[PDB]
Structure formats: C-alpha cells, structure tokens
Ligand binder design. Sequence first.
Ligand SMILES: Nc1nc2c(ncn2[C@@H]2O[C@H](COP(=O)(O)OP(=O)(O)OP(=O)(O)O)[C@@H](O)[C@H]2O)c(=O)[nH]1
Ligand SMILES: CCC[C@@H](NC(=O)[C@]1(C)CSC(/C(C)=N/O)=N1)c1cc(OCC2CC2)cc(=O)o1
Ligand SMILES: Nc1nc2c(ncn2[C@@H]2O[C@H](COP(=O)(O)OP(=O)(O)O)[C@@H](O)[C@H]2O)c(=O)[nH]1
Ligand SMILES: [Ca+2]
Ligand SMILES: [Mg+2]
Ligand SMILES: [Mg+2]
Lengths: 57, 440, 414
Amino acid sequence: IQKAIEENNNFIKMAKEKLAQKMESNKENREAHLAAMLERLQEKDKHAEEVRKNKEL
Amino acid sequence: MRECISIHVGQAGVQIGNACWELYCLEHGIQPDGQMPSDKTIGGGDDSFNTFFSETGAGKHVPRAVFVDLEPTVIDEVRTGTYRQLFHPEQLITGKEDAANNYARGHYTIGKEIIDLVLDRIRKLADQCTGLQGFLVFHSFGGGTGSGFTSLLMERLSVDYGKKSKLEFSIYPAPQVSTAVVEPYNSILTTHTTLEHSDCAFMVDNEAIYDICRRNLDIERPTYTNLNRLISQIVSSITASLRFDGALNVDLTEFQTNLVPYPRIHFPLATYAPVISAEKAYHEQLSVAEITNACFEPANQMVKCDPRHGKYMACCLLYRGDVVPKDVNAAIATIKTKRSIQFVDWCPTGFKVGINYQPPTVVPGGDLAKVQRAVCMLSNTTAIAEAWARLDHKFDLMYAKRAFVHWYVGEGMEEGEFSEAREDMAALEKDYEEVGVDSV
Amino acid sequence: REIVHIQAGQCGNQIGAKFWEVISDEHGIDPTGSYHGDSDLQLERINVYYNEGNKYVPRAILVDLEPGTMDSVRSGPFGQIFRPDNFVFGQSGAGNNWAKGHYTEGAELVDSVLDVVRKESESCDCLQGFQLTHSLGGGTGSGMGTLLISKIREEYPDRIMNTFSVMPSPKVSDTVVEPYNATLSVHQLVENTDETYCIDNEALYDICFRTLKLTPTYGDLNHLVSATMSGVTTCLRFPGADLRKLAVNMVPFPRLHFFMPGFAPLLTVPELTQQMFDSKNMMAACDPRHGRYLTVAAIFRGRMSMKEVDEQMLNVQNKNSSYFVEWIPNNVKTAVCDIPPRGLKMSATFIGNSTAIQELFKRISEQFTAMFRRKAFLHWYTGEGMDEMEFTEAESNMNDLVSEYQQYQDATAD
Ligand SMILES: Nc1nc2c(ncn2[C@@H]2O[C@H](COP(=O)(O)OP(=O)(O)OP(=O)(O)O)[C@@H](O)[C@H]2O)c(=O)[nH]1
Ligand SMILES: CCC[C@@H](NC(=O)[C@]1(C)CSC(/C(C)=N/O)=N1)c1cc(OCC2CC2)cc(=O)o1
Ligand SMILES: Nc1nc2c(ncn2[C@@H]2O[C@H](COP(=O)(O)OP(=O)(O)O)[C@@H](O)[C@H]2O)c(=O)[nH]1
Ligand SMILES: [Ca+2]
Ligand SMILES: [Mg+2]
Ligand SMILES: [Mg+2]
C-alpha cells in the first residue's frame, strides 16, 4: 500500500514539474521572440533618424 | 455517491455538451427550469441520476458540468438558450480571444490566463460530491482550445486529483467541415500530451458521423446540430449505466476493465444502432438480432477503420430498452458464426453484455426516430490505429516543409515539441502492432 | 471583435471610400449613419466596422499629405458618415516620392495619426487588428503607409495587420518612379504585415478593357476593388473566424503572405466556380496555372445549393490537382453566405496564396532594375537622406521573395 501511495505521489510530482518547465520555457521563448521584434523596429527608428540627419547635412 | 463531473471545452465540446444535457433532461424527466416532479426527495438524494445532477433546496436539478471556451460566442447561446435556467452562471466560463486554431495559444498564451479560474470552478463542484468518481472531458482534436487548453487542463487535473479517472470524448477531424489546415498539428500535439493523463478516450470521427446522417437519415448536408444529436445518443448509451439503475445494468467501470489491457491502449471503437429516420421506422420494428448485426457493419462505426483487417482485444455490448438476455445470447450466437471476429491469442473471446431497461429518448423535432431498443458496442480493436496513421501522415506532409510551424513558434513552442509528439504517436502505432502479434 | 480601418494616400482614400459605401448599403446604413434595414442579420456583426444617438460611425481613419483627395470624400456620397476628428491631413504633400512618405513629410504627421488610432482602439471591446487601403506606386500610400504599419506594430505587436495594396502598372502610370515606390514598400510589407491582398492595376485595366469592354477610368477600376473587398470581408460582416484564425490557416510561411484576389461574375454554381478560378478573373496579373496554390479561401454569396458548392469545389481541386501542393492537405476552405451582394443574385470571391504571384514581383523588379541600372531619378530619394544600399537592399529582398515562391513551387511530397 505504501508503494501504491509512493507511485501516485511521484506521478503527481513529475506532472507538476514537467508542466512547470513547459510553462517557463514557453514564457522565455515567447518573450525573446517578442523582444527581437521590438528590437528590429528600434533599428528602423535608428536608421530613420540617421536618414533625416543625413538630409540636413 | 459516485458522482461524475463533465467538462466541455471549446465550441465542439460545448455544443456537444448542450445536446447531451438536453437529452439527459429528457431521459430523466427534468424540465428546462431544472424541476423534476418525479423526484420526491428534495434537496438531495442518492438516486442513480444524482451521479450527473445535483439538487438545490428549491428543487432544481443542476448538472455537474463546466463549460469553458476562450471566446464567448458559443457559450453565450447557452446563457440565453432554452436551458439557461439549468446552469448556475459560474459553470459557464468564457474568455475574450480564442486560440485561432493554434494549440500553443490554447495551452500557453491564452489558456494560462483562465486555467486557474477553471480549476477553482471545478473544485467547487467536486466539494459537493460525497464520492467523486471521475471526469468526462468533451473536446475537439482540431481546435486551439479543444486541443491546447484541454491538454493543459488534463495535466492540471492529474495534479489536483491524483489518478482519479478521466475519460475523453474527442472529436476526430474530418477535412470536410474543418476550418483548420493545421488540424493535424493540434491533433498530434494534444494526443501526445494527454496520453498519460487519460484512462479511456472515445474518439468520434466527424466524417463517420457525417456519413451516417447522409445515409441513414437522408440529410443532404448535415449540420453540427445533426451530428451532435447523434453523438449525444452514443454518449447517453455509454453513460446510461451510471445514470440509471437496473438488475442487468453493468457499470461502465466494469467494461473499462476489459477494454484497457495496457494504459496506452485505451481507445475503444464505438458502434451504434439503430440510426433510422421516422419514415423508415414506421411499420418496421428492428429486433435485437437486427440492431446487434448492425454493430458489426463498419458503416455504423464512430471512427473510419476496418476491424475485419485487425484483431479484437475486447467486445462489449451496451443494450438499452426492451431487451432480455435470451434474445441477446441468440443474436450473439448467430454473429459468432457469420462474422470475422478474430481475437488476439492472449484475451478471451467472450462478449460482455449490459442491458439498461430505460428505453431511448429522442429530441422532439429531431430527425432520429424513437425506437424501443438500441445498442452501443464498445470494442478494443487494433484497427483504430488506422485513424492514427491517417492523421500522422498529414502531419508528416506539412512538417517536412515546416508549414505553419512559425505560428506555433511565435507563441513560444519549439520544434522539439513537434518531433517529440510525433515520435510518441509512432510508438503508439507500433504498440498497436505489437499487441496484435501472436505469442511465443 | 472590432477592426480598425485606415486609408492613406490618394488611392487609399478613394478605394476606402468606395468600400464603406458598399458595406454601408449591405448593412442598411445611409449617408447620415442611421439604420433603415429590413433584416436583423445586418446588425449582428455591425460592430466589426462601426461604432454606436442611435447612429453608426465607421471605425475608419483617413490619412493623406494633401487635402485634395480627402476634401472630395467629405462632399461625396456617404462623406458625412465619417467622424470629422478622424480626418488627418497635411499640406506639403508627398510628390509621389516614397522617401517623403516614409521619412520626411510622412514622419512629421505619423504621430498625429497614431493618436487617432489609440482613441479608436481604446473603444474596442476586443480589437482584432487593422486593415489598410493604399497604393504602392505613390508616395503617401506607399511611403507613409509602410511607416504607419511599422509604428502600429510597435504599440500593437500582437494584433493582426492586413493591407489592400494597389500595385503599379505602366498601363495606368501616373509617374515614372513607380517601380521605386513599389519595390521600397514591398521591402517593408514582407516584414510587418500578416496578409497582403495584391490589387494589380494591370489586372483591373485588362478586366475593364477586355472583359467588360471599356475602351477605363479610376471609377471603373475601383468598382472592381469595392466588389472584391466586399466579398473578402463577407465572412467577417455576416453570421454563419477572426483575423488571426484566418491568417493562421492562409499563411504557411511568414514572408509568403501575398494573395491573388478573384471575383465572379465579372448563372450556375459550376459556371460560377470555373470562372472564379480562371486567370481572366484574377485581380492580379498572374496566371495561377504557371504556379501552385499553397492555400485558397473562397466565399459564395446568394441562395445556392450548399451541397452543390461542396461538390463543385471538390471537383475543381480533383481535376486541377497539379496546381495545389500535395504537402498541405485540405488547403482549400469555402464558405457560403445566404445574403447576396448588391445587383447580383449570386457571386463568388476567392483569395489564393499562389507561387505564381512571383510573376507580379518579376514585373516590378524588371521595371526597377531598368531604372536603377542607370541611377535614374535617384536624386528625389538621396536628397531626402537615403543611400544607394537601401535601394539595393529592397531589390535583393524582393528577389529573395521570388526565389522562395519558386522553392515551394518545386517542392514535392516524396
Ligand atoms: N461534431 C462536432 N464537431 C465540431 C463542432 N464544432 C467544431 N467542431 C470541429 O472542431 C474542429 C475545430 O475546433 P473547434 O472546436 O471549432 O475550435 P475550438 O475548440 O473552439 O478552438 P479555437 O476556436 O481555435 O479557439 C473542427 O474539426 C470542427 O469540425 C460541433 O459542434 N460538433
Ligand atoms: C474569399 C474569402 C476571403 C475570406 N475568407 C473566408 O470567407 C473563408 C471562407 C471563411 S473561413 C476561411 C479560412 C481561412 N479558414 O481557415 N476562409 C478572408 C477574409 C479576411 O479578412 C481580411 C480583412 C482585411 C479584410 C482574411 C482571409 O484570410 O480570408
Ligand atoms: N485602382 C486605383 N489606383 C489608383 C487610384 N489612384 C491612384 N492609383 C494608383 O496609385 C499610384 C499613385 O499613388 P497615389 O496613391 O495616387 O499617390 P499618393 O497620393 O502619394 O498616395 C499610381 O500607380 C496609380 O495607378 C484609384 O483611384 N484607383
Ligand atoms: Ca432527489
Ligand atoms: Mg472556438
Ligand atoms: Mg496621385
């Protein structure tokens, strides 16, 4: 009976853990993808300010 | 005691939940306002129908159910539908933005915003149970909510309720009425993730339910209302042993013992008969032998496959209505001599029989004729793996070119999850091959 | 589920104006904003494009660096139904110069445009995304249009962005530097839009001249565009899928999101279907039988046997299987709307993500390299602060886009 208890608690434990890793790796990946997008749009603004500065020259 | 909690996820799960609960109410004499005149014990009771219905002091019989969707348009129809007074508002949970047929959005981006609320509402229903038996989860494989959020929920239920039984009713995609080209992706992903958290899953091929409505009910282009009223009959036949009493009544859990030889081999093939229009049922009463013979006609299966080219590991017959054992044993004897029922060599060849004497009911205004007797056959056959092979082949075609995969990666998923899920399905296809080979 | 509409440039505002006239009529809206329709289906999805004294105001934003085109909108039909605060115009103009629209005369005004976007979006219960009407041959629609898309994507990174882009054709050339404005704006659309519907003027001109037999004004070309745009948005505007769900199923690869529209008639379901798939009914100057379809979406309008539509769409696929890639199963989706258009008992609109669209980019690239090979008219751009690399980059990016369409046209299942 204690072996049955142990296996149920270990199944609950592993499930809770595997799910926790999934929801963290996904949070990190999505934040990174969205950071790269906003970073590229920052280089467009940097390139645009350099275009307007090259004109007045 | 022995209560069951139903969870309906996404459009398909919700709209099928509507058909089932409407049908349950008709079977138990429960009015749209929740009143049940025949119920003399007010406020509670341990009747068979109390496994699915709780009772209030005002005499209202409330389903032990939860409807969940990431957008509100489908559940709003339940809020303003014929059975609006049947459900407490807290049993109807809705978000604002759907999953867009994206598993990743249903499991992560959007689903993680409502999962805690859903679990809290499921907990409130479980606290009303004196001896909770398990859950019934209705969902599609193809939708982003049906696939993604269902996988997340099943994972969370395993944590919060241990190995308490969880049964699935899953809508297997049919290209025809499908609006998702990425449906194979969502199907493989959800099957892989839920496989270790589900004890028994009943797949329903929309294409099979579609053909049965065109052929047997003479409906040119069936709608979801047509499909769902037929699906509800199958669900009713399967759950009738939990909601009704009877001497010859065999509990679903007892069938489950025979249907699941290994944890991963838990996908029974369902077959239902009779499906007959009123015009044809008039002056033609189908006997026990006729509806039993129809169970072994592949045209009546819920999933497109050929059991005649596979092997059986179990055969269960769930009769309901005017049926006695004498007729059943006579009909089975005939079929045992006229059909190719080949069993694996490590399982006995007997047919397990159950009989519920409450006759079947039909939704008024529907296309299904009211019959005196009906039967649902639950068989565990290797042939159901054909449904995996068709879906895995479509997966492979698109994934070889990484078609549409950027939508999943953009939400935070990795390609490793795709390959990992596809390999699990490959092992499952192999598992169904291994169980069919003869012993040494 | 609200959509925010934006009109930019001369073309963008005239196409957008026609669009609102068509859908306003379909929803029973009069030029003053009142509802006088006979069907409740006209109001079930009215909030998608309109806000609510028991009136309906388009959720639209009109933009242009010159008041000429926009002033004609206020006076024209349905001109008063628009919200006056949503008119945002300058004075100096763009001079059909992409640089002026994307960097100079456009960057100064872009901020005041965003302010109107924020106000409209904050009144949305659940904003789906945006749609833009503009041309790629001008200066405001192309230069400032692409700029505004990049700026909207910063504040609304998780909202779908669609564009109805009018492509330049020598048969209706208003200028000679159009191959520059198109190649520069295409360089942008490849990065910051989820779906782009290529409205090719060459196709509209050939439809008006050959088919309709008009030996053609911008009003004739736009009568096609208004019918195309009405059919495309049908599933959104009448009951019976949000922008993201649509984009998820139509865009197998992020860069390949440029579609060929089609409309019919320009009558039975077989005839209607065959005409809709004919190269003569394409709103883009591309022959689909010179490439392969990655995805297709079709909408049928009118009282017609749905069982017949299902069989006719399965028939065309089977008999034309060679023009649909085998590695995307079930890549043709179809809908039926019981409400017909105006003046037609039954019509059909279709959008296709076909590899044959490279023909459109091959034409714009040839007109570009023909001028860039000699540095013609480059002072209109370098004078605004550009360099030559930015021109070559846009050329290389659009050339790579053609190579990718060819990669998947050649791909095989085995
Ligand atoms: N049998 C049946 N199938 C349905 C029904 N509704 C949708 N489906 C199927 O479900 C699949 C699409 O998933 P849906 O359930 O509609 O989508 P969802 O679960 O709400 O998830 P998202 O909408 O993407 O957020 C397709 O294969 C449909 O054919 C229904 O009422 N009955
Ligand atoms: C010719 C039909 C075009 C229409 N598509 C449909 O009407 C159906 C049939 C409904 S379902 C569906 C899909 C993709 N299912 O998977 N295609 C459509 C509309 C649309 O709005 C764009 C906004 C700017 C205006 C985007 C799109 O991509 O397709
Ligand atoms: N179909 C159509 N195309 C137009 C219309 N007006 C301009 N165009 C095209 O758009 C290009 C010029 O861009 P335009 O929008 O007029 O310049 P802008 O005022 O700076 O935005 C040319 O190639 C024209 O062929 C119109 O009313 N209908
Ligand atoms: Ca009672
Ligand atoms: Mg949904
Ligand atoms: Mg102009």
